[model samples]
Target: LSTWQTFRRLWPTIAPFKAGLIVAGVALILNAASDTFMLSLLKPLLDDGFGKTDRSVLVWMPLVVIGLMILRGITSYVSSYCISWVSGKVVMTMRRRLFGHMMGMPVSFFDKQSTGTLLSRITYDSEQVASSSSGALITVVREGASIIGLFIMMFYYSWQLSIILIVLAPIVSIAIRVVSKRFNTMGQVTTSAEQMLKGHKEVLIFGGQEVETKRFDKVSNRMRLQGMKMVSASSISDPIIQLIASLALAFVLYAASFPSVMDSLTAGTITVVFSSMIALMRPLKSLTNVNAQFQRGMAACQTLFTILDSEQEKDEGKRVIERATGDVEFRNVTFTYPGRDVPALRNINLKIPAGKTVALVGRSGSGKSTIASLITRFYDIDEGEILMDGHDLREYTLASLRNQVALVSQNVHLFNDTVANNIAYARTEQYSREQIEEAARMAYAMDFINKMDNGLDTVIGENGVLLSGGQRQRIAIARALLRDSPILILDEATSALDTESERAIQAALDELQKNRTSLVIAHRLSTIEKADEIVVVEDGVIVERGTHNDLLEHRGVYAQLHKMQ
Candidate 1:
């Protein structure tokens, strides 16, 4: 979306604070007018109050000027305070909405976008919006009002001088236009490059350090060059405009000082004219500078709107299906990822009865995890229907469907929060302390958790970096157990654990699977040896199916994979 369109959409968020905005704007205008009027008063206080040797008028005039100063201060304070309050609230509301929208996006959306890129959009990009909104508000009220008030004073003093000054406006405007165009182009490239660098940190850390550095340096160099050019152009424009204004001022002073003109005009009038001319120049210069800042702000706004305008996951049209029975069916499902020609899952059909455990055994690229993801409706199939308890998955609300399923993947992700919060991640309000403890105990995480300084309240690092791989997996298991969902998905959940850790986790998994409908995806043959049903998938197609021994007896893909393990 364009910057103007984004700003238009953002209006509703600021609507509630319109009253405060109006008060602030009025205050700013009043303050600017008072300041300009006070400057004009200087001539009267000097000529009428003191020029004729009137001592009493000097004392009263000083008192009047002081009173006006106090009024200006109060008005300025009100203006700044109101705008600050409104700006902060607006930013907070926008952030909350952006974050909530991001959370609702489909899993497929995340699969296609990197985590770091998304983080940058949420953090840095949102901050830009906030900063720009606040800065823009101040510019529009404070600088804008000053410009208007000063212009009026300038014209009052000398209309000819005012007209000459106005002639330079178009020249300054053209300079701003050229700079803004360049800034917009550079801003887009800079934003993209920053996200790319953030997302590729792992690549740099692992092996691409030198190569990545060189690539980033190239982009950084271009950004620096563009930035320098903008500064140079702005520097040239401001001085040239100032020089023209100065020349105009010299001509005005010369005309005013002519013998015929000097004799007719009072000293006070000359003083007022010169003061107003100087005051007006400052505001004009400020307007020119503010234009550059506005361009950068608008560029940032455009980048932010790109993410906000992206197609959000479809969640509103579906009906809510509560209390799913765990009866799942994938009928003729076929899915291919974006930018890929080959399908991840080919024409396939599968069914698992309610309250049963099924195991999927396959090689690395054999579509076991893809099947699990499809079952959870993480990604809609290219052409097929998934049914849960006889209801189409797409018919259910995304939240309702996901609430019934809990997944524990090979690499578990934990937030930098308390253990209790992480374990009871699904529903904080629904779980009690005792319930959380029991869930953690069941997953074999309670013992280690208790050893921490604060037990359940102990904070974990990002992605559970402070915890070992086994510990992180156990926490993930604890989270699933606490969820108490009817459908459990274990995708190589024990792959990172040692023999002892795996045994403990396997025991917990067995207990958790007692009455729950579970789908287990494993690489180790021994892990699913006792599963009620075993299915072997190869090249996105199920090649063999039955119990472990039955598949072994069939001597098909399952048997071959088992022998290799």
Candidate 2:
């Protein structure tokens, strides 16, 4: 079965806790054995000692039963504790490994997966693994052992009566199978309904309320119908199975009345046979239901394993750069995003000399941001080489290559941390409080930081939800200022700010860019007039290049774009 294959694949995770599993395994056996022992005692009590005035039988029997129950209680507790401990440990191990692996996955991997799915993989799927490994496993093992033990006791008491239960077994299992299959169908309908409701925002924004509601009604109505079917199936299965079970017992009682069938059966033996048959039903029912739980966990494991097995970002470079000289050149670089046929950048050649500021001005989707992504080595170029300090970008280790550049993009990312910490988030150098404050002041973020109740120490909620968009941008700018990387790529860094804030921060940016290689991708033409070089890109090609004045004199793409502004 695929169950064995899943277990084989999961063996590595289970192997470490061999000793704990052994202890739990023994306790589970003891717990199951304890039930059979209690049932076995019923025969001796009924036949030999019920009407006898023997004090020793009375005294010792109660003491032995009490002692046996205490032992059973202890075994059950140990079994539960060990299983829970092992399950929790397994979940933590998987979650931590999965989270760490995700952290190292390529940026393109994230682009293809939604945040919600990745989050659920870590939180929900890992839990399913735990339940499968412990909860479902324990039930199957414990209940299976109990069922076998009960069957043995039943056959020992009266083979003819046991034949009655054996004959009805297939009928009972068939009923269980029918109900289980119905539940599986209902579950799919419920999940379909849940998935559609998750896109509520899209429905509201597109004015699709009535349409979405009707679509949802179709799904919900199917769920309701399936639910009704499930209830009816369960309602019918429960009593019909009970009727079959009662018929089996009635057959046993009828057969027992005959002298031939009663030859080996006493009052105690008949009671034991009856009680064992009753006890067998619960474990059998539980064992049947376990398949659904086991399958759910196995499905979760497949989803998690697929991610774990995916190739992580490749870092093949042996050379390490302590610091780069801030020279960047793209030579015949043509690139297309993964899963796209059209090139985002085509045969683009550009150069930004050490300590020079070059501004790239273009309309959106003209490959301004693509250049920044390439420089940071987020995606390797398809056809050409990007070089930094005369070395091919791929020659340096990814970390060392990226360490030399700081980027402030259109979307600012801020951690849910103190204002001071957000600014200093990924900086390698330990900047002092004074230096952090200086960077904030330079970015014009100190203006608002000073107004906050706790200033730099105040907590900013996730991604700076407490701050305005302008405030968030300024904080990002402050972070870049603190990074002090040799190369800076600012992709509309001031797009979120008001004119007054932009004007104030422009001077700080100009000062910061002076000794650094700055690639400015700007929408606002006024910000780049003083840039050493201006490159005008259109339709994945650079059509004009020169100083701002030189582009204006040419009266071409750059001038037309500037005129529009």
Candidate 3:
């Protein structure tokens, strides 16, 4: 959406804090009024008291000026404090809503976007909004009031001079508008460049260190160039506006020096008008610059709202199944990944009975993993239907449908939290400490966990980086065991481990699959030799299906794949 539209959308979030906003706004007006009033008093003090040599009038003038100074200070303090409070509250509310919305977005959203980009939206983008709002509040409100008050006073003092100065207003306005356009373009590029840098660690780990580093340097250089250009533009505009204002000031002074004009005004009145004119000029300059700040803020709001306004996951399902029976069926299902030409999964029909162990064996990109994802409804099928427990999967609420399944994948990700928390992640509130330990023991993780310093309370580093691949896999298995769901999905769960670790984890998998309806996607043929049924898939199509022995006897796709493995 356009930047203005984004700002309009954000108004609702800022509306609730209007009371604090209004108070701050009033304080800003009062502060500006006091400053203008103090400047106006200069003429009266100079012409009436000093020019007339009235010592008594001079004595009271100083006291009045001091009192005005104190009032302005108090109003400035109130404006600053209230704006800080309101802006902080607005930012906090926006952050909470954005996070919650992100969590509810469809899986396709995550698949197409990088985690680092999303992290930037939640962290860096939100921070920019907060910082800009807090910093710009006083300038927008106080400077705005001061500019208006000063314009009125300028016209009152000398209408002809004011008319000449007003021509500079439009010139400044157009210059600021041009500067804001460039600032917004640079702001977007900088935001994207920073987010790209966040993924540098992943690039290094994947062994594209040199290529990624060069790419990052290119992006950083571009950002630097854009920032410098913006600075140059601002530099040019500021001096041009100042020059115009200076020329106008010179004309005003020349006009004031004439005896015909000077004789009519009292000495003190002229002093006050001169001081007020100077004071008013400063806010006019600030008012001219305020457009750039506003544009930057709106640019940030545009980036933030882009993510917030994207399509969310469907929530139309009203039916809830308390206990799924584990029966699963796929009828002529087809799916194509976003931005890909061909379907990942073609027309296929399959059914697995409750409590059956079904193994899908295939080479990379042969649709084994796709089948697992479809069953879990991670990506909705483009055509045909998926049924669970004899009902359309889409008919059931997402939470209810997902509650029946447990997944253990090759890349096991554990948060940087305690061991107990990682193991009990799936069913923490429903299970107790003893139950968690028992599940861990069953997965063969308890033996090693017990050896650690804090046992279940031991902290796991980010993504379980402190643990070995085998240990991470075991912990994932323990989590699945604790879930005790009717259907279990193992997506090459032991592929990352060494032979010895795989054998140990395979044993735990054997125990975990006893009563559950299991869908096992494996690259290693030997792992699924004992499965109740084996289905061979090749190039997005199922080629063969039967017991391991039966497929071997048939001498088909499964038999050849087994021989190659």
Candidate 4:
């Protein structure tokens, strides 16, 4: 959806609250008409009550004024309440839709943009759009009608003052135009400032507080400086308008000095018309601000619309399989990352038999992890294809493809959830609590679990911050263990563990790969020593392939790399 479409889509949410808007709009019209009627009474009450004696005129004037104030109070309450209700509904719906859409986008979308900038669109931009949406509607209906209603009634009493008031109306619109661009810039700069400020924790820990603080301050000050300039223009305009209105009032009196002016209207008629012109000052200024509000929302909404309309990963596969049977093949696969010239993987041909174990041994950036990622189809290859169970990976639905393999990388990701839920995260309903406990125990995490107060139910902080390096790794291992998939890809899965920790977990890791077809990528030579076969990659090409002992005996690139440890 585009922002305009999303804006229209929000009307359904606001449909229930539309009665509030209708009632409020009618009340505003009534309120403005009441003010005009009160001004109309001023001319007749002053000329008739004071210039002549009539007790009924005196009695009726105060009663009408009291009745107008009571009516004004009731209408003002309805106007404020209803507009706020509709705006709140728009804001709430906007935020939820944006969050859902981003979560469903392709991996490439996140690679191009920061999480901080995306978050600012939801929290900051949506608010401005809501404010802008309602501001224009209310101003046109309430304020515009108020000016037209008051002007016609005031002109009925005094002609010369009404002519002067009508001529100066364009001054308000000109002042608003000057500031509209300024506030549009204000919304853009504020979003930038928020993006830079999301580094609050990053700055403190990375020790760049002074440098980060300077950049945030510079952007924020520019936002403030730009907005205040708009404010200064509006402020200057109001005073200039007041001065012109004073000049018009002076002309009305000077024109009144002539006997010809008095021949047409009384002194009371001139005063009421002058009061009506002064009354227009507040609503006229309101119309100017409404323009600025819309420009600000438009600038913010444009940023949001890009996210809403971006293409997501396609999921159109009709193929489905009960299980992969753990066989995987890479046939002439070649791929280069986006914005990179050289291929990350080139002309790769490899196969893993069902229930067999294979290891990928290579130096950093030698395409070890890239091979594992392609098997899971995180990205489409530039040429050739990856297959599982003799079928092309793309032929199967993404959900079924992912279900056939379990991944455990060195960079573990854990939610702020209980330990049992974290381990059972892959298929919660499929695994019982006893099964979760069994998996955790098999990963050798049961050693620490028995000592913890909550056991399996303990709530871990984000990314398992409450746990140590080896503990999170074990929990991650347990998560993969609980998946019970036919294939396993452990890419540098135990790189964080020390010598003793590695020794302790190695046997458990060996047991996990017993029946499953495992593809292990490891820098530690000891971890791959017992694999059925070891494939040595160098610079996106396979340099050597054999059993680990056979490769060492061959004394080629694999042997050259092994001596580094």
Candidate 5:
């Protein structure tokens, strides 16, 4: 969208804080008025105070000037405080809304987006918008006010010199344009170099220090040259503008030298003109600089608004159920992941009777896990209906639908929280310590939890980075156990565990599946041998289904997979 359109969209969020904004707005204008007023006072000081005919003028002049300076200081404080407060509030509001919107997005949105991209939107992009709103707005209004005040002073003192000064506007603007134009334009090489340094293991194992450092040096040199060019432009542009402003002053002086022009002007008036013209330089530069900041803000606004405008996960169903009977059926379900040509699951028909276990065995990418995902409603089927507890899956509200199922997948996600909390995560009702401990024990996680410094109270790092892969998986299983939902989906849940740990967890898994409708996706053939039914899948199609012993005698896909294992 255009910048104006972006602003119009953002105004709704900004409108609520108008009270604080007005307070800051008034203080900013007052501050700008003080700048012009202080300089304007010089005219009278030079004209009257120095005349010595009234020594009282000096005493009263200093007092008045000091009094006004104090007032300007108060306005500056209020403006700074109020702008900072409003900006902080604006950023907080934006970050919260952006995060809430992300939470409402479908699972596929998460699959397609990187964590860093989403995080930067909340952390970095939101701040950019706030700064543009408050900081850049401040510069535009405050400096704009000061500039106009100076112009008023200029034209009042002498109209001829002011017109000459006005003629220099285009020249000054071009100088600013030169400066602003230079600020435009590197990121790919730096990212590669950063990875080389951060991926310390690979660099050390391969003895790649020489080539890596050489690559780093090349990119670093490029960055250094870019920095030097930026500094050269920035350092040179200021004096060039200053010199142009001086040239304008020279032009005004030259115009003042005419006998006719000098007749109307006094020493006091000429000095005011010179000071006012010099004063315009800084504000103009600041006014020009804010354009870049404002553009950055607009771009950030576009990104955030686009995300907000996206279609959230479709939870259109009004049906609500507290505890659904553990029966799930997939009827001619065909599903293709977003942006993929081939379907992940094709015409899959499966059923798990209440309180029964169905184990799906297949090679990687054979759609075993896709079946579990569909059961959990992570992605809706493109072709057919999924029935949960005799109703179409879409008939239930998403929260109620999800509440009936608990998942333990290969990739376990844990929060940076206490071990007990991780085990009892995301429950409407709190879990007692005893209950959390029982879940951990059943998942074979109690051994490590007891060994940790704080036991169940231990603070794990982000995603449990402080723990090993098997430990993280155990915690995830414990979390699912704690959930105690009617339907359980275990997608290679024990893939990370050692032989002893897997053996220990197998008994707990068998017990957990006894009275629950369980869908187990496993690569390990031994884990599913005792399941009520074992189904074999290949290339998005079911190839075989029977009891493990029956399949073994049949010498079909499941038998072959079992023999391989």
Candidate 6:
């Protein structure tokens, strides 16, 4: 049942390929039966030919053997191909579902999981499942069929010898059950050790190599010991089974030696039945080890099911915002990360009127960035309400709400693609070459882009490693400008720029900010002096809110921060 339960849970992945599995099963049966059919001829060879010297019997028997071989060859091909198809298809489906599910999961999910482990589950773990269903199942079932076939021939022969064979089978099976449990646990240990080894290999920390090596050695040593224990346990089984077979053979020979049993069974029948029993020994040994392989698949499938069943992001909003008027308000909003007790944002009440620019000023970790995140509903507020154009941000569809905002942040992400595609990005249907180039020009990105070999068509390396830091920042700005959402957010957007470079970007930003409701998060006080209002945030609370000159006049948190910069 422990093995059957794993199969049942994994059946959905196999359900689509049921017909192929049926064909493979039929092929396996044919292949197993063909071998048994050849062995069945041992009865005729001795009874019909050897004692009588019958020439026709010998000639026809050899032809039947050749014909059976051809059938086995055909069935082998079908079994291999069909099983491979099922395995490959299941892994592909799992990878697709896993990736799509990961994309739909909450941002907090990404924060909690290690990227290496998640990728490992999708790649290595899924393959483990396929091997269980595809490779291991093939061996277990084929050998199981062979065992059954051998029994049929034994039963057809003398009942005394066959009865003795059946009695000894249970003893071998019982011993196998005890051996397999220990083997499965040892295999899991090896997997964890190898995963640890691969991790250390990928991240070779300077001066920490010795520490990592010692940690790896600890895991590896345990794996080596456990592996040897399993091997030792398995080694004990072969000889034990061989001894049982030798005893079974002894009983069969003793029974044949009796006058009544000799009259009951001829040499021809005895040879065929005894040969079938010997064949069972090898497959029986193989069958005993299959349960351990099944356990491995069990672990792999259980891990993937855990990920597939995780909760998705909140998206019950029915309101579809088609370009909000850019008025946003936060009313006593408070939030903390999932595991942390300390609040990242607390009692944060503020408002940005339509077509106005507001700057958020604060020291590092003062929750300035948390405000920008809340505006997009990246992480939901633990308390109070966030409003978009007088409606709760949660009330609007996530797509509709995010579409109304264009953000250019400190961490700019660029794909390994050309300059033009990165700028146009998700809104490619709305913008053309002329419009993309125009937006690029406005962000002061064209100066460096034009200097490149292919201009807009140049292939940038990973995260635009081929480009300078300032150049990458401009490309991100151009993407925001191209989006042209009603709400604009510049979160340290120009922090990468020089004084001369800043002026060009500032002029473009000034033009872009003319009609949009915008939030500017900056440490440099010079950037936000022109904003219509500046809000000072300190330790998750709003300390002061006023125009740039008004905050300076008051000489509070904003004044103190401005003086330091």
lDDT ranking from best to worst? 5, 2, 6, 4, 3, 1
TM-score of 6: 0.77
Error in Å for residue 272 of model 5: 3.0
What lDDT does the true structure give each of the candidates? 0.75, 0.82, 0.77, 0.78, 0.82, 0.81
Q: For model 6, how many clashes?
A: 0
Candidate 2 per-residue C-alpha lDDT over 1-565 given as tens digits, one digit per residue, 9 for 90 to 100:
7755776787799789877888998898888889899899887787776657355368757887998899899999998888888888888998998999999999899999998899999998898877876868788779988999999999977888898778877876676566656545466566655765777677678887787568657776777888787688767667766676787778778988999988889878999999988998789778877887888788788788889999899999888989886689999999999999889889899999998889888877678778888888999888988989888999989999988988775376777888998889865258898999899998888888989999999998765578876677677778888888899888783466454467756666776777888998876556588788888888777887887458558545865777776
Scored by lDDT, model 5 comes in at 0.82
Pick by TM-score: 3 or 6, better one? 3
TM-score of 3: 0.79
- Which pairs of residues have clashing backbones in candidate 3? 43-268, 43-269, 43-272, 44-268, 47-267, 47-268
Per-residue lDDT over 57-167 for candidate 3, one digit per residue giving the tens place of the 0 to 100 score: 767577888899999999988987888888788778878878998988988899888998888777777767756665566677788887777778767766655665567
lDDT of 1 by residue, 1-565 (tens): 4556767766777899998888988888888878887877866776777667676376757787888889899998998888888878876786776688778777767887898888777677666665776666767767788777777776776665566557755664575566545546477567756776776867756687676667767777788888898788767755565566676677767776667666755667667767876876666556656655656666766665666777777765377766776689888889887778799888888888888878888887667888898878777778988888887888888888888898886576777889999888857878998999999999888878889999998898666667877777777788888887889888783466454467777777777777888888876555577677888888878887886458558656665677776
Using lDDT as the yardstick, the better of models 1 and 6 is: 6
What candidate 2 gets wrong by more than 4 Å, as runs, is: 1-3, 44-49, 52-62, 178-239, 259-268, 289-292, 427-429, 450-453, 461-465, 493-511, 551-555, 559-565
lDDT of 5 by residue, 364-388 (tens): 7677888888877888888988999
After superposition, the stretches of candidate 5 with alpha carbons farther than 4 Å from their true spots are: 53-58, 174-215, 254-268, 289-292, 461-465, 498-511, 551-554, 558-565
- TM-score per candidate, chains pooled: 0.78, 0.85, 0.79, 0.78, 0.88, 0.77
- Please say which candidate is ahead in lDDT: 1 or 4: 4
RMSD of every prediction: 5.3, 4.2, 5.3, 5.7, 3.3, 5.6
Selected candidate, larger lDDT, 2 vs 3: 2
* Evaluation by TM-score, superior candidate among 1 and 4: 1
Count of backbone collisions in candidate 1: 0
Model 1's alpha-carbon lDDT is 0.75
